[PDB]
Amino acid sequence: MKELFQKIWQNELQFLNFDAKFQDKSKLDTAECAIILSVNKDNYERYFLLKEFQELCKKIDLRVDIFSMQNAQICILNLFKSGFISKQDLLKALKILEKISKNTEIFDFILQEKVQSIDQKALFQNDFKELNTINLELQKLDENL
Amino acid sequence: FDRLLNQFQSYEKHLLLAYENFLKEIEILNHQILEQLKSISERISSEIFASV
Amino acid sequence: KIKNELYKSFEEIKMKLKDFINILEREILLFKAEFSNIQKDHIFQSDKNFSELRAFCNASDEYFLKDFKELLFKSILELDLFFEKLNLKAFTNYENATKLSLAFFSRKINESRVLYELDYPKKSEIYERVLNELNVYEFETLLINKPILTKIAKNFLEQSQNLIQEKNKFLDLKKAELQKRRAQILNVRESIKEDHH
Amino acid sequence: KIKNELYKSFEEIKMKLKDFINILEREILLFKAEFSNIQKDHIFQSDKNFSELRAFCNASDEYFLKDFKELLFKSILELDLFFEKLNLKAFTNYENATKLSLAFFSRKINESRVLYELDYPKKSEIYERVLNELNVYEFETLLINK
C-alpha cells in the first residue's frame, strides 16, 4: 500500500514501516480511525491547526506531526486487515467525513481489499472462558470473596 | 538521543553476532578456492602426462 | 563452471556486507523520519529547541549514514579487485599455464634424450609445475596465510565499530547540551524549594 | 617504468574526476552552511518558514551531494579494474609472453629441422607472436575501437 500513501501524501510521504505496531487495538474507535484516515496531505495543515483535532489526537496518544499521522494511518489500515476491527461501517464514516475531506482514495482501498478471517464468536467464547478461568483462580485463593 | 545511541549499539551487537558465521563462511570459501585451483592443476597435469 | 561458482560466492559476500549497511540504513532513516517533524505539545516548550532538533534529525543521513556507505563501497572495490586478480592469473590463464608447463616438460625430455651415452616425467612433478604456473603459491598465501577476504571483512567490522564510536561521541555532545539546560532548571527548582531559609 | 607511467596516468584521471566532485561539493556545503542558519529579520516574517528552510538546507548534503559521490566511486572502481586487467595481462605477463613465443619458435625451428632428406624465424612473425601473447588485439580494441 505504499502506492496508496504516495497517492495521499504526494510529496510529504515519509520513510516509514508499513505494519501496525499498534499496542492496544482499542486505542481509538471507528469514527476516530476514519478521521485519522481523512488527514490526506491536502487537509493536514488545517487539521493540525484545528483545536478539536488536537484534542482528538491527544485522546488517541498521537502527535500532530506528519510522520506520526502517516504511521497511525498505516497501523489503522493493518488493523483493518489483520485484527479486522472495521466493516463497511468504516467506509460509512469516511463517506460521512466527505463533508470535509473528499478522500476517495482510502475509501476505495478499504472497499477493494481482501478483508480477513472474521472469527468473532469463537474469540468471544475464548475470552469468556479465559475470564472464567481467572475467576476460578481467584476463588482458589476469603469466603465472602 | 538515547534511543539513537541504543540503536547504534544494537547494530554493533548484531554485526558481532553475524560475523561468527560470516567469518567461518569466508574461511570455507578460501579453502574452496584453493582446492578448486588444485583440482584444475591435477586435471592439467593428468592431461600433460597423457601426451607423453 | 568453477569460475562461475567463485564469482557467485564473491557476489554473496558483497551482498552480506550490503545487507548489514541496509539494516543500519533503515534504522537511521526511520529515526530521521520520526524526529525531523516532532512538534512541541503545549506552550512554554521552547519552539526554537524543537526546530533545531528537527533540523538535526533531518540532516541525520549525512550525520550517521554516508560514512558507512563509503566504507561498504571501499570493501566492495577491494573484493572485486581480488576476484579480478584470481580470474586473470588462475581461472583464465589455465590455457597459458598448460602451454608453458607442457613446453617446459618437452624441452626437459629432449634434454634427457640428447644424453646419447645411455649413461622420464613423473606425474607429481607435472602437478607441481602446473600448480606454480597457475600462481597457487601466491593464492595459497592470499587465501590461507594472509586471507584477503577475511582481512576485508575484519576491516569492515573494525571500521564500522570505530564509526559507531564516533557517532556515539557526536551524540554525547547533544546530550551534554541538554544537560546544561537541565542543570539550570534544577538550580531554579532547588532555589524555589529551599527559599524557606 | 612504463607500467609506473601508466599507473600514474590512471591516478591522474581518477584525480580529475575527484576534483570535479570536490568543486561541486564545496559549493554545496557552503550553501548548506549559509542557509542552515538563516534567521528572520522582521516581526511579520514566518518563523516556521525559516525553520523549515534551515532544516532543508541542513539536509542538502543528502539532497544534492551523495549521488555524485556514488557515481564518482563507481567510475573509480571501473578505472581501477581496467588498469588491473591491463597490468595482469600485459605489463606483468611479458616474461610469460616471452617464454611462450620463444618456446613456440624453438619448436617450429626443430620441426623445420626434422624435415631432413636434402629438402627460419623472421622478425615480423616474432613481433606478431609477442604482440598476440601480450593481448594487444584485446587492448587495441579496448583502447581505440571501444
Residue numbers in the entry:
A (entry chain A): 1 to 141, 144 to 147
B (entry chain C): 305 to 356
C (entry chain C): 408 to 526, 534 to 611
D (entry chain D): 408 to 526, 534 to 560
Which of the paper's sentences describe this entry?
Here we structurally and biochemically characterise the DLP pair from Campylobacter jejuni. The respective proteins, here called Cj-DLP1 (84.5 kDa) and Cj-DLP2 (71.2 kDa), were cloned, expressed and purified. Both DLPs are monomeric in solution and form a stable heterotypic tetramer, termed Cj-DLP1/2tetramer, with 2:2 stoichiometry when mixed. The tetramer is dominated by a 2-fold symmetry where Cj-DLP2 with its symmetry mate (termed Cj-DLP2α and Cj-DLP2β) form a central back-to-back cis dimer flanked on each side by Cj-DLP1 (termed Cj-DLP1α and Cj-DLP1β). Combined with GTPase activity and lipid binding, we present a mechanism for how the tetramer tethers and bridges distantly opposing membranes.
Crystals of Cj-DLP1/2tetramer were obtained in the apo state and the structure solved. As observed in solution, the asymmetric unit of Cj-DLP1/2tetramer comprises a heterotypic tetramer in 2:2 ratio. Both Cj-DLP1 and Cj-DLP2 have a core DLP-like fold with GTPase, neck and trunk domains. Here, Cj-DLP2H1 is partially clamped by Cj-DLP1 G-domain helix 18 and terminates in close proximity to Cj-DLP1 hinge 2, meaning it is ideally positioned to modulate Cj-DLP1 conformation upon binding. Connection between the Cj-DLP2H1/Cj-DLP1AD complex and the bulk of Cj-DLP2 is therefore via a 9 amino acid random coil linker only (termed Cj-DLP2linker). Hinge 1 acts as a fulcrum with the trunks of Cj-DLP1α and Cj-DLP1β assuming significantly different conformations relative to each other. Cj-DLP1α forms an open linear conformation, whereas the Cj-DLP1β trunk is rotated in plane ~125° towards the neck C-terminus.
